[PDB]
Design a protein around this ligand. Structure first.
Ligand SMILES: Nc1ncc2ccc(OCCc3ccccc3)cc2n1
Length: 172
């Protein structure tokens, strides 16, 4: 049915978390009327909650830090669903600090997952996909659930600008 069944839980969760961390967050939900199979509605909640929490906690910076960096004091967190053909696309986008791709590469080298010699030409997708590696509620589990639903997940991010996580599910 409508994804609002999941999305309606989130405003109070988001607001509670932002408050606790001295963040002002404009949380915008779009496409809440988007319908898809009830299995997906029943299961996508916990993964989305992790992404929202990540954005508030790790993404959106404290107001003082936003001001210091010359960003709007209020951060923006957008949760959207839409139809794209026979798939539904769910996006979680924030205008926070972004994911530090350099830090990912440094850790992958440290963990012996890649050699330094390969770092210079790694694609952005290949870098950000290390986030799904176990040990790198967890981001690994987010991907495992999405893929159990025959979905896919990708991440785009730019330092200091923010992060967008995209989930594609079938309508099934
Ligand atoms: N939206 C956003 N913005 C900045 C981030 C910066 C780092 C990031 O990973 C580290 C935190 C993490 C914990 C447990 C499982 C997965 C990831 C995630 C981030 N996400």
């Amino acid at each position: 049915v409508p994804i609002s069944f999941v999305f309606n839980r989130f405003p109070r969760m988001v607001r509670d978390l932002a408050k606790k961390m001295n963040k002002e967050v404009n949380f915008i939900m779009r496409g809440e009327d988007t319908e898809l199979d009830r299995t997906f509605v029943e299961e996508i909640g916990e993964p989305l909650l992790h992404l929202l929490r990540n954005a508030i906690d790790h993404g959106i910076e404290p107001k003082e830090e936003r001001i210091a960096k010359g960003k709007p004091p209020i951060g923006t967190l957008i949760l959207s669903a839409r139809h794209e053909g026979n798939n539904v696309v769910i996006e979680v986008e924030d205008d926070g600090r972004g994911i530090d791709k350099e830090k990912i590469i440094r850790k992958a080298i440290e963990k012996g997952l890649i050699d330094e010699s390969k770092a210079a030409t790694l694609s952005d997708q290949e870098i950000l996909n290390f986030l799904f590696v176990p040990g790198f509620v967890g981001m690994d589990v987010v991907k495992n659930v999405v893929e159990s639903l025959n979905g896919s997940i990708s991440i785009e991010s730019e330092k200091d600008k923010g992060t967008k996580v995209t989930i594609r599910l079938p309508l099934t």
